[PDB]
Design a binder for these strands. Structure first.
Ligand SMILES: [Mg+2]
Ligand SMILES: [Mg+2]
Ligand SMILES: [Mg+2]
Ligand SMILES: [Mg+2]
Ligand SMILES: [Mg+2]
Ligand SMILES: [Mg+2]
Ligand SMILES: [Mg+2]
Ligand SMILES: [Mg+2]
Ligand SMILES: [Mg+2]
Ligand SMILES: [Mg+2]
Ligand SMILES: [Mg+2]
Ligand SMILES: [Mg+2]
Ligand SMILES: [Mg+2]
Ligand SMILES: [Mg+2]
Ligand SMILES: [Mg+2]
Ligand SMILES: [Mg+2]
Ligand SMILES: [Mg+2]
Ligand SMILES: [Mg+2]
Ligand SMILES: [Mg+2]
Ligand SMILES: [Mg+2]
Ligand SMILES: [Mg+2]
Ligand SMILES: [Mg+2]
Ligand SMILES: [Mg+2]
Ligand SMILES: [Mg+2]
Ligand SMILES: [Mg+2]
Ligand SMILES: [Mg+2]
Ligand SMILES: [Mg+2]
Ligand SMILES: [Mg+2]
Ligand SMILES: [Mg+2]
Ligand SMILES: [Mg+2]
Ligand SMILES: [Mg+2]
Ligand SMILES: [Mg+2]
Ligand SMILES: [Mg+2]
Ligand SMILES: [Mg+2]
Ligand SMILES: [Mg+2]
Ligand SMILES: [Mg+2]
Ligand SMILES: [Mg+2]
Ligand SMILES: [Mg+2]
Ligand SMILES: [Mg+2]
Ligand SMILES: [Mg+2]
Ligand SMILES: [Mg+2]
Ligand SMILES: [Mg+2]
Ligand SMILES: [Mg+2]
Ligand SMILES: [Mg+2]
Ligand SMILES: [Mg+2]
Ligand SMILES: [Mg+2]
Ligand SMILES: [Mg+2]
Ligand SMILES: [Mg+2]
Ligand SMILES: [Mg+2]
Ligand SMILES: [Mg+2]
Ligand SMILES: [Mg+2]
Ligand SMILES: [Mg+2]
Ligand SMILES: [Mg+2]
Ligand SMILES: [Mg+2]
Ligand SMILES: [Mg+2]
Ligand SMILES: [Mg+2]
Ligand SMILES: [Mg+2]
Ligand SMILES: [Mg+2]
Ligand SMILES: [Mg+2]
Ligand SMILES: [Zn+2]
Lengths: 18, 206, 155, 97, 23, 97, 83, 60, 127
RNA sequence: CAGGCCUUGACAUGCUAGGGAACCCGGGUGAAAGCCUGGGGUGCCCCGCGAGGGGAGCCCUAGCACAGGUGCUGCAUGGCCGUCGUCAGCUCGUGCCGUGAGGUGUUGGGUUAAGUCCCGCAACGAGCGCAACCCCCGCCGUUAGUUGCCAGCGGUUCGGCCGGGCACUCUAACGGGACUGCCCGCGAAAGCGGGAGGAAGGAGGGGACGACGUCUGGUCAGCAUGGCCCUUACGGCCUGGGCGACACACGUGCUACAAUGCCCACUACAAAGCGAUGCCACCCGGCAACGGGGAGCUAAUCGCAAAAAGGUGGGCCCAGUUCGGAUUGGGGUCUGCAACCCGACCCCAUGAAGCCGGAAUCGCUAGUAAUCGCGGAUCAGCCAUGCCGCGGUGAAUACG
């Protein structure tokens, strides 16, 4: 649901958080 | 993608460094960061003038900035007004004897970067790229160049499918070193991304 | 390769018998460009072969080479659905290289510990007709005779 | 009365060892001709492209050529006419004695 | 021996010195 | 042994094991499948199943693409089969004369 | 390891904390991020909560573990094999 | 993370070790040459422009 | 009275001074045979004057700097070959057919980026 | 990634309001960051012999804009790069042919590394490519003579040391030089075979140089950039941890399995580079890493420096070994705020696997491959056995 890669299932959103 | 930058190709043969000055390992970068920053304000400002080349000389905490343009009067200012207003903000950054001068560009249509900048704005203004391309090649030929090639790459006309358009009349022998080939680039920003204009002018061999 | 025949390199003679062939052979002893060692081994061999056999080393060396030069060799050549071993003449250029190769090669298979001894000995037997290097010449030669049947496929 | 020239351009490094070894050659007396010290090449080797492609580079160098010239018989007639001479931009001068 | 730090051969290779390659 | 790369994408040990099961079909030809390397990827309009596999008789390179990732794997297997079968009987083709 | 000439390294901010714990009479629990710290004999018998990136690991310190640094007893990589 | 780090590179650090080259031009933390203050990309870019004094494509 | 040829091999450069003598030969302040001890390549250094029977008619005070022994050896061979031609230019015959007068330009080839050496390319796995 | 924090924000251009400018010294808590807090003096143009009064060179605080994002999309892009491929090709103009796609030219015969050139031809030209102009090396001349050089003469502490000289080496700029120019022979020719001279001969060797284009190749994480997204958080700061994990598998390498080798001692010959909190001469301390002193060099001056293979001599004696140097214990050294994760080096001890490697597969055509060292960038240090260079010794083979 947030940054880069790999995705978190939300459009264009990976699993990295700030 | 392949072709060598034809100015860097001829440096010290058919063209000469835009910034000439020795400096020692202790100093080089700091001096170059000026030449970068110097070209910063200048290329930012004198753009509307018609900036085409920016020499920088140094000798001893003093720097001599040659500026070759199609509109010398734009930089010189109101009878001396701007050319003043610059040496100030220059010697502010320079922090030193920021000697400035202005050079006439005899024929502008024979200095690549000017043709390039023109096509750039000409497409930023939404003119048919292909036409604008063939015209630029025409004007450089009318100005008696021995050949000319201009190259627009990107979303030409806003087409989703980026594309490379180019026209080339005459000779443009880029493998030839004695060929005096003036190359310059300009970067057209549009509502749909950046295009890139490359211009080649063959002014004749040596 | 494709365009034209290779040109056989010429090799300056060795400075101890003036022989073009001793040079060639010393090269075949040389690992890692260490020719000084290589010459030292060949000459030190000559030291030995002179001792244990009172003949001129060069005489024996050259004689060994003649007795290892294969006159015929098989060379594979797929015709239809089989690779036939074809009996073909050996050019003297190649006879040289094989006998030089096989001498070293068989020599370094011998049991005696010092290299110049192994060269000295393989040279003494190939001159007399014994030795793994001679064997290789014979084995290669029985093959070509065996498959004389396919001499007509020679190119 | 040494004169030690440095510069990335040799067309100008040789140009100004000339004019130096012509000033004192005029204002008298002797000068030991411009000698070319061995160059000091500082190269840079760069992956020709932005991302990967490790196996392609472009070689850049930076020559700092060196000229040494001597004012043999100093003779302060030189000294003054040298105190105003014309060295182009990319040249640096190390005068000692 | 170029892998064996306890020879002059290995110290030429590491490029270090010591007991087995002094200076 | 067999390597699977899931490029810019995330698969499971189930999907990895599916690839091995599908790749297994190439074993019918009874020839060494040497370090078979399957890459998976996902383009805007379909998955891509790459595979590079060398055999004692040459290499198998093929790429399948399809909206269904599983189908793309199959189209990849198909291409690889046809190549591998060609590797195995191209030699017979010129037995006479 | 570190030079002998230079002194043994404690962070001189955990050490402030442990000395008063000697003086006033220990023990409280000492939360620290000072992995790099050598254990020093003044610490023996305390219990320090050593951060490892994720959690503060109690370590009871003892005579036999005074040579070692405080990270050598709160491991960083969580791992139970492959299977 | 970029601009916060082109700036954080500039500041004098709690410890001298943390000092690290960045490109004055583009900010690149990697392949930064001391002599130009430049990374290899920028180095190539300006050098081809001829704005690196005496910096010429070598060929031997 | 005394004759000279410049001898240059790889990075080896040799200054040869042919001087009529008993046969003595010095290479960099020590007699040849002691400077090329254990180098069987050596005798080739003196070879040009064997093809003009000049073996012991001369001496040679030779300095050499650069490269390695066997380069310096070929640098030498060239020099004394060079030097013998100023002594007598009729000497090209019995020097030039024996190729002594010509200097091979075979230099270490340059290292090239993308290789492990000049031409030795890096190993890859196409598959 | 965890945790403690910041909310015009690490950074821009602003506009307005409270102070003061500016700045420097801290003190409390705290892992640091932060948060709280203690000190002190703003010039000018001004009414100032005066309180007081700004406006602004800059400071902070609240605000509102905005910042910030190595967050997504290389299937929106520029730039630059890889690749086919240094391959001999790709086209255009006009003419000609075809209803048209298109053809011709560019095919053909000969020749070449080459769409290289010759000849022929409904073609005739032209452009991009090829080549050449550029760099390095090979020979020679000129110009130079220190810090480089030492042929001869003088001295000489015995070291080109000094005097002396620039011859030679060199060094580094400028020229020359090679053109199938000449001879033979075959050729219509272009060229091809052979020869002479010559340092070099048929592009001398190497480099730089990469056509239209292909791979919806590569790179939104170098940079730029459209659009999409985040806004006390997808921005930012710090401490720690991670990027170094380890049942496995693949790539690229190093070092090996030994006697053409290994060890020790002594003894030679390079080139290219780098070097003012840098290279360190030399003396001393320690087996040593190193430490302490301490000269010289802004460096053709002094230094890194020893090159190593080699050479001489001695040792080992075919053994998992005096091969191999992995792994582990113990003890140190240095960098650095800090070497637990997670540095390199040194020493003592340990002394693994490995007896030449299956299917398969890589490189290289000559000063190459092989083998040996040396340097550099990055860099405090270093995980470099990598990379880019540099020279040393120096092959085999090409029928086809
Ligand atoms: Mg963050
Ligand atoms: Mg062999
Ligand atoms: Mg055999
Ligand atoms: Mg028999
Ligand atoms: Mg590589
Ligand atoms: Mg050992
Ligand atoms: Mg896998
Ligand atoms: Mg992944
Ligand atoms: Mg996965
Ligand atoms: Mg998408
Ligand atoms: Mg889809
Ligand atoms: Mg693919
Ligand atoms: Mg099927
Ligand atoms: Mg088929
Ligand atoms: Mg940015
Ligand atoms: Mg650092
Ligand atoms: Mg950096
Ligand atoms: Mg030279
Ligand atoms: Mg001898
Ligand atoms: Mg080499
Ligand atoms: Mg690769
Ligand atoms: Mg793309
Ligand atoms: Mg991608
Ligand atoms: Mg692109
Ligand atoms: Mg037409
Ligand atoms: Mg028709
Ligand atoms: Mg028609
Ligand atoms: Mg047409
Ligand atoms: Mg064509
Ligand atoms: Mg066509
Ligand atoms: Mg033809
Ligand atoms: Mg070609
Ligand atoms: Mg053509
Ligand atoms: Mg034609
Ligand atoms: Mg002269
Ligand atoms: Mg020929
Ligand atoms: Mg070319
Ligand atoms: Mg793509
Ligand atoms: Mg970006
Ligand atoms: Mg974007
Ligand atoms: Mg919009
Ligand atoms: Mg942090
Ligand atoms: Mg990593
Ligand atoms: Mg597995
Ligand atoms: Mg490695
Ligand atoms: Mg190896
Ligand atoms: Mg360094
Ligand atoms: Mg054994
Ligand atoms: Mg054992
Ligand atoms: Mg075992
Ligand atoms: Mg052992
Ligand atoms: Mg230990
Ligand atoms: Mg560590
Ligand atoms: Mg082996
Ligand atoms: Mg093998
Ligand atoms: Mg096989
Ligand atoms: Mg070895
Ligand atoms: Mg190295
Ligand atoms: Mg380093
Ligand atoms: Zn940069």
């Amino acid at each position: 649901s947030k940054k880069s890669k790999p995705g978190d299932g939300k459009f264009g959103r990976g699993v990295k958080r700030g | 993608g392949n072709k060598i930058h034809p100015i860097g190709f001829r440096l010290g043969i058919t063209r000469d460094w835009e910034s000439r000055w020795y400096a020692g390992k202790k100093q080089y970068r700091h001096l170059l960061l000026e030449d970068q920053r110097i070209r910063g304000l200048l290329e930012k400002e004198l753009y509307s003038a018609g900036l085409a080349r920016v020499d920088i000389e140094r000798a001893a905490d003093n720097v001599a900035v040659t500026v070759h343009v199609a509109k010398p009067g734009v930089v010189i200012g109101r009878g001396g007004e701007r050319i003043r207003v610059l040496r100030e903000e220059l010697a502010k950054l320079t922090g030193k004897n920021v000697a400035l001068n202005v050079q006439e560009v005899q024929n502008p249509n024979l200095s690549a970067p000017l043709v390039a900048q023109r096509v750039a704005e000409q497409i930023e203004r939404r003119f048919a790229v292909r036409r604008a391309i063939k015209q630029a090649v025409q004007r450089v030929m009318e100005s008696g160049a021995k050949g000319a090639k201009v190259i627009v790459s990107g979303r030409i006309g806003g087409a989703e499918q980026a594309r490379t358009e180019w026209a080339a009349q005459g000779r443009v022998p880029l493998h030839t070193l004695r060929a005096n080939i003036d190359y310059g680039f300009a970067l057209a920003r549009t509502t749909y991304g950046v295009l890139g204009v490359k211009a080649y002018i063959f002014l004749g061999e040596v | 390769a494709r365009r034209r025949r290779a040109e056989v390199r010429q090799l300056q003679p060795d400075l101890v018998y003036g022989d073009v062939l001793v040079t060639a052979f010393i090269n075949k002893i040389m690992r890692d460009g260490k020719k000084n060692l290589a010459a030292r081994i060949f000459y030190d061999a000559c030291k030995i072969i002179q001792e244990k056999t009172g003949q001129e080393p060069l005489k024996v060396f050259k004689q060994a080479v003649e007795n290892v030069k294969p006159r015929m060799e098989v060379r594979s050549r797929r015709v239809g659905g089989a690779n036939y071993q074809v009996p073909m003449e050996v050019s003297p250029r190649r006879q040289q290289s094989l006998a030089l190769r096989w001498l070293v090669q068989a020599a370094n298979q011998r049991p005696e510990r010092r290299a110049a001894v192994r060269i000295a000995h393989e040279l003494m037997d190939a001159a007399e007709g014994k030795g793994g290097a001679v064997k290789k010449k014979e084995d290669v030669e029985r093959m070509a005779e065996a498959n004389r049947a396919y001499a007509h496929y020679r190119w | 009365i040494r004169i030690k020239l440095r510069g990335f351009d040799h067309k100008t490094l040789d140009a100004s060892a000339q004019k130096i070894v012509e000033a004192a050659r005029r204002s008298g007396a002797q000068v030991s001709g411009p000698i070319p010290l061995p160059t000091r090449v500082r190269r840079f080797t760069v992956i020709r492209g932005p991302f990967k492609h490790k196996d392609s580079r472009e070689h850049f160098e930076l020559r700092t050529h060196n000229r040494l010239v001597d004012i043999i018989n100093p003779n302060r007639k030189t000294i003054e006419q040298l105190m105003t001479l014309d060295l182009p931009t990319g040249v640096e001068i190390e005068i000692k004695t | 021996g170029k892998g064996d730090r306890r020879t002059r051969r290995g110290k030429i290779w590491r490029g270090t010195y010591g007991k087995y390659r002094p200076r | 042994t067999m390597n699977i790369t899931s490029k810019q994408m995330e698969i499971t040990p189930a999907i990895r094991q599916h690839v091995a099961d599908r790749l297994a079909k190439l074993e019918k030809w009874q020839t060494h499948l040497i370090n078979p390397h399957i890459i998976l990827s996902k383009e805007p309009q379909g998955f891509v199943a790459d595979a590079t596999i060398n055999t004692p008789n040459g290499v198998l390179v093929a790429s399948g693409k399809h909206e269904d990732m599983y189908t793309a794997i199959n189209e990849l297997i198909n291409k690889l089969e046809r190549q591998l079968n060609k590797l195995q009987h191209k030699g017979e083709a010129r037995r006479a004369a | 390891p570190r030079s002998l000439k230079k002194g043994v390294f404690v962070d001189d901010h955990l050490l402030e904390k442990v000395l008063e714990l000697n003086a006033k009479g220990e023990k409280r629990l000492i939360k620290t991020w000072s992995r790099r710290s050598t254990i020093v004999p003044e610490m023996v018998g305390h219990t320090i909560a050593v951060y490892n990136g994720k959690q503060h690991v109690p370590v009871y310190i003892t005579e036999n573990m005074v040579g070692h640094k405080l990270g050598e007893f709160a491991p960083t990589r969580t791992y139970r094999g492959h299977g | 993370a970029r601009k916060a780090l082109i700036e954080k590179a500039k500041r004098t650090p709690k410890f001298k070790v943390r000092a690290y080259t960045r490109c004055v031009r583009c900010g690149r933390a990697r392949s930064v040459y001391r002599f130009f203050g430049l990374c290899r990309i920028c180095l190539r870019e300006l050098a081809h422009k001829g704005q690196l004094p005496g910096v010429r494509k070598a060929s031997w | 009275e005394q004759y000279y040829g410049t001898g240059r091999r790889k990075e080896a450069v040799a200054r040869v001074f042919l001087r009529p003598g008993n046969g003595k030969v010095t290479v960099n302040g020590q007699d040849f045979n002691e400077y090329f001890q254990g180098l069987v390549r050596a005798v080739a250094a003196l070879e040009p004057l064997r093809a003009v029977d000049a073996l012991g008619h001369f001496d040679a005070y030779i300095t050499v700097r650069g490269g390695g022994k066997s380069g310096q050896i070929d640098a030498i061979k060239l020099g004394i070959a060079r030097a013998l031609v100023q002594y007598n230019p009729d000497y090209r015959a019995k020097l030039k057919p024996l190729g002594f007068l010509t200097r091979d330009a075979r230099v270490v080839e340059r290292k090239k980026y993308g290789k492990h050496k000049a031409r030795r390319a890096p190993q890859y796995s196409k598959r």
